[PDB]
């Protein structure tokens, strides 16, 4: 119904948070790599 659209929307926003996080982990990782 209208409810299932709200649920799909919520899950989509939820996944965006996971995308922000893995990107921030990658940023941190680049900062922490060995250099030479």
């Amino acid at each position: 119904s209208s409810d299932n659209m709200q649920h799909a929307y919520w899950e989509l926003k939820r996944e965006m948070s996971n995308l922000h996080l893995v990107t921030q982990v990658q940023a941190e990782l680049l900062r922490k790599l060995k250099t030479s």
Binding site: N4, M5, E11, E15, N18, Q26, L33, K34
Partner: protein, 46 residues
């Protein structure tokens, strides 16, 4: 607009699944970097 709305719901479902796939691949890239990566003045594409 129930025909356009059903496709919006399914569209949002598909986007979520695609995003999941990207997150998984970015995490795999991160794992490679965590184990083997370095930054060097003369690293890069050689």
């Amino acid at each position: 607009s129930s025909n356009t709305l059903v496709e919006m719901t399914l569209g949002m479902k598909k986007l979520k699944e695609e995003m999941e796939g990207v997150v998984k691949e970015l995490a795999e890239n991160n794992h490679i970097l965590e184990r083997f990566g370095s930054l060097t003045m003369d690293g890069g594409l050689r």
